[PDB]
Structure 1
Amino acid sequence: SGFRKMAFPSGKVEGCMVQVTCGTTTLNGLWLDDVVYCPRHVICTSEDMLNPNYEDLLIRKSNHNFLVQAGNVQLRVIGHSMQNCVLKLKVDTANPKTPKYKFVRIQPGQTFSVLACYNGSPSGVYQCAMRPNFTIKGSFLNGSCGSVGFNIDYDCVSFCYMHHMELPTGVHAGTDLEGNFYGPFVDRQTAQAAGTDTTITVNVLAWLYAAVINGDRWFLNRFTTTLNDFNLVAMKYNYEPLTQDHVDILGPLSAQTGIAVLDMCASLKELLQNGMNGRTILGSALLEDEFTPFDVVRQCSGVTF
């Protein structure tokens, strides 16, 4: 019993974290085989971050300008290239701790673990979700740039996120490992704002099934609804539309608990229109949307890595 916000064990990623220094800027890099990946804004100064021509800034740098530190060892940079918003530093030594890995781009509503780092040293691990507005509600301070997001499937680490910046509202923006930003963001000091956020409906439903599996049933009702009727209700409360794919994905949880997806939707509609009324669900007075249907199955069955 119990339901916690759980992250993947971070060990496979810890053995990849390095510190990257260029001029006055120090941030984190990810050392896989003989390449160190880090945000390209590590080459920016004070005037540069205003209007940066990264090709112009990069051509002026030599390999010895990038100081890379893996623990108490300095790695020697033998080449450099840029791929979108990520800098790739070729090093002379292949990381002996390199795990089996893939670079994957995730969709909004998917979750991942973040290994927050400062000066190439891991300090914490937390679980979070890519918001529908493409931001992440992370916990980051200055120097955390280059910290990575990942999932672990069996023994393979899927790297999906690299931290680049904080938006004025305190939320965070970054890229996949190929340097493509999630969201309409750019890596420079300029007026940027996160769009209006919405609730990840499929995730709230998965979390309601997790509550049922854990003995919480007060919110259940005899009623059912249609996808059209539920999507009208959901649009009024800034909830993401629920698709037939979402219903199909929730099928195993519907079979285990005996509550049809549209039956749980009628429970969710009643909760949106009437509130919790002093009650909680899994120790929360708000509807939680940072557990996917897969996270619920994985945790309520104990899958290991």
Structure 2
Amino acid sequence: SGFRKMAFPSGKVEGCMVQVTCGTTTLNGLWLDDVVYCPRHVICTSEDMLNPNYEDLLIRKSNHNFLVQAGNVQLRVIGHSMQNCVLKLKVDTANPKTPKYKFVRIQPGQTFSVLACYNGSPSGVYQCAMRPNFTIKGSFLNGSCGSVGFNIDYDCVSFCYMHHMELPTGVHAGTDLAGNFYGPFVDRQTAQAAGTDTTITVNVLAWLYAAVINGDRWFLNRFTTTLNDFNLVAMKYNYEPLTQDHVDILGPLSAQTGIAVLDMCASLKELLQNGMNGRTILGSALLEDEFTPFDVVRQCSGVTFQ
């Protein structure tokens, strides 16, 4: 028993991290087969960064301008090309540590692990959710760009995020591995704001099921509600709408605990209307929304990976 914010084991990704230095910029790259993926704004300098034209900046570059460093071994760049907001640097050596992988784009509400890196060297690993407003609430310092977010599916690493920038509220924006931003952000030093966020309702209910599996039941109640009456309550509290699909994904957790999804909705309603009365749930005094139904099942059932 117990419930923790749990990251995927990071070994498979640590072996793919390299340092990319060009001009006055150093950042992290992702080395899979003979390609190194990194944020395209490495080809910049601090005045290029007010409003650049990356297509122009890139034809001015030479292969030998890109210093790629895999630990204490240098990689020769033999080609370069830009795919949206990422650079693909072709190197003459294929990474012998390349895991089975996919590039996947995730949906708001879904979670992933982030391997925070500096200078090609992993610093820490932590779990994140993609917020409804396509930001993530990460922990990133200068030099962390090119760190990647990922999920693991048995032995396959699905890369879903590459880090690019911090927005003024301390939240973070980035791209998928094909270089397409999550949300309406651009890799420019121009005024940009996150936009209004909402709470991920299906994840909150999942975390309430995790609590019940773990012995926290005080918030349960005999009442029930309709899907429609629940969604009027979520609207007011800035929760995002609950669909019949979300009810289906919560079926397994409903079955394991004996609590109908719509009964747990009625509990969420009262929690929203009454607060928590100085009590806690799974050691939080807030309703937590960064655990998906799948995260809960993995942790409360013991799924592993090879």
TM-score by length of 1: 1.00
Q: Distance in 2 between matches of 1:216 and 1:166?
A: 36
Q: Distance in 2 between matches of 1:93 and 1:191?
A: 40
Q: Provide, for residues 187-241 of structure 1, a one-character-per-residue CA deviation record: whole Å limited to 9, x for no partner.
A: 0000000011100000000000000000110000011111111111001111011
Give how far 1:296 is off: 0.3
SS state at 1:296 partner: helix
SS state at 1:21 partner: strand
Q: Tell which deviates more after alignment, 71-80 or 222-231.
A: 222-231
Q: Distance in 2 between matches of 1:158 and 1:112?
A: 9
SS state at 2:294 partner: helix
SS state at 2:271 partner: helix
Q: Distance in 2 between matches of 1:94 and 1:195?
A: 41
Q: Distance in 2 between matches of 1:46 and 1:151?
A: 33
Q: Distance in 1 between matches of 2:265 and 2:28?
A: 43
Q: Distance in 1 between matches of 2:77 and 2:294?
A: 40
Q: Distance in 1 between matches of 2:297 and 2:110?
A: 14
Q: Provide, for residues 151-182 of structure 1, a one-character-per-residue CA deviation record: whole Å limited to 9, x for no partner.
A: 00000000000000000111000000000000
Q: Provide, for residues 23-79 of structure 1, a one-character-per-residue CA deviation record: whole Å limited to 9, x for no partner.
A: 000000000000000000001112211111000000000100000000000000000
SS state at 1:42 partner: helix
Q: Distance in 1 between matches of 2:163 and 2:51?
A: 20
Q: Distance in 2 between matches of 1:61 and 1:138?
A: 32
Gaps of 5+ in 1: none
- What corresponds to 2:134 in structure 1? 134
Q: Distance in 2 between matches of 1:104 and 1:223?
A: 40
Q: Tell which deviates more after alignment, 240-249 or 44-53.
A: 44-53
- What corresponds to 1:190 in structure 2? 190
1:66 matched to 2:66: yes
SS state at 1:300 partner: helix
Q: Distance in 2 between matches of 1:100 and 1:46?
A: 37
Q: Provide, for residues 237-283 of structure 1, a one-character-per-residue CA deviation record: whole Å limited to 9, x for no partner.
A: 11011111100000000010011111000000000000000100000
- What corresponds to 1:75 in structure 2? 75
SS state at 1:20 partner: strand
Q: Distance in 1 between matches of 2:226 and 2:42?
A: 51
SS state at 2:301 partner: coil
Q: Distance in 2 between matches of 1:60 and 1:161?
A: 28
SS state at 1:113 partner: strand
Q: Distance in 2 between matches of 1:46 and 1:276?
A: 48
Q: Provide, for residues 90-122 of structure 1, a one-character-per-residue CA deviation record: whole Å limited to 9, x for no partner.
A: 000000000000000000000000000000000
Q: Provide, for residues 274-293 of structure 1, a one-character-per-residue CA deviation record: whole Å limited to 9, x for no partner.
A: 00001000000000000000
Q: Distance in 1 between matches of 2:123 and 2:49?
A: 27
Q: Distance in 2 between matches of 1:204 and 1:136?
A: 17
- Aligned-residue Cα RMSD (Å) equals 0.4
Q: Distance in 2 between matches of 1:271 and 1:127?
A: 25
Q: Distance in 1 between matches of 2:28 and 2:97?
A: 17
**Seq. identity, %:** 100
- What corresponds to 1:40 in structure 2? 40
